């Protein structure tokens, strides 16, 4: 029996980048325009926040300790004890109004993250201004490809030979051959085409059977896809339309956490979606995900 439950009611403006930290039994995430990195201890049920000085679009675990995040167009390191945040590297220095969007750590500890032009409204922005980058463990930055509208959801196959990637405004999930030892990619192809009512593909995670779960922004749902066949396997709807991302968490990665937004909703929309901006948990899916990788620098 699938169960969808609103488990944290903090009314974020745009919750994003959920990441499960098993060591602390906490959910890490960001609220982008609110310029906070959040850590929700699911045991004490208490949320701690680190304020930052620009929109923060993603957060990831740092292997050596603490966290890393994408703030503005900067990869940054966070020490939680002192709330110290410092720049590791900067990208898009020749772009006037870009920011990072979604990011995630690859199986070799590289922090992949892509950028976008800054929006004036959801999906209203200068086109093709972003690029996909990765921050290597030695703190150097690799630039992969440009002409990205809105860099979004991403993950890697379990055999670590394929990289899955969403540019939201292409309305497709794409795949690349990916080399674990070097972090190179190539041979880009479409592996799923979004249907009209699935709206905008946003965040994404892989499950333990190699299927992809995609949060559908404006679509009020997550969908499960088979990248090998190009077919949707499952849909699970939520009572909020602006579902932004998803990850697996809890014991044995058997629960799914879903972030969502209230930004962009009109007065009627807010009333119809009282839990807009909150964190949801989905149980009873019948698959487990995998642990996130930690950044190795
Ligand atoms: Ca996103």
Author numbering: 3 to 299
Quote the paper.
Biochemical studies suggested that SMP30 is a gluconolactonase (GNL, EC 3.1.1.17) and requires a divalent metal ion such as Zn2+ and Mn2+ for its gluconolactonase activity.
In this study, we determined the crystal structures of mouse SMP30/GNL, which catalyzes formation of the γ-lactone-ring of l-gulonate in the ascorbic acid biosynthetic pathway, in substrate-free and substrate/product-analogue complex forms. The crystal structures of mouse and human SMP30/GNL in the substrate-free form were determined at 1.95 Å and 1.50 Å resolutions, respectively. Since Ca2+ was the most abundant metal ion in the purified sample, a Ca2+ ion was placed at the metal site for the crystallographic refinement. The coordination geometry of the divalent metal ion was quite similar to that of human SMP30/GNL. The asymmetric unit of the mouse and human SMP30/GNL contained two SMP30/GNL molecules. However, molecular weight analysis with static light scattering revealed that mouse and human SMP30/GNL exist as a monomer in solution. The overall structure of mouse SMP30/GNL was essentially the same as that of human SMP30/GNL. Least-squares fitting of mouse and human SMP30/GNL with corresponding 297 Cα atoms gave a root-mean-square (rms) deviation of approximately 0.6 Å.
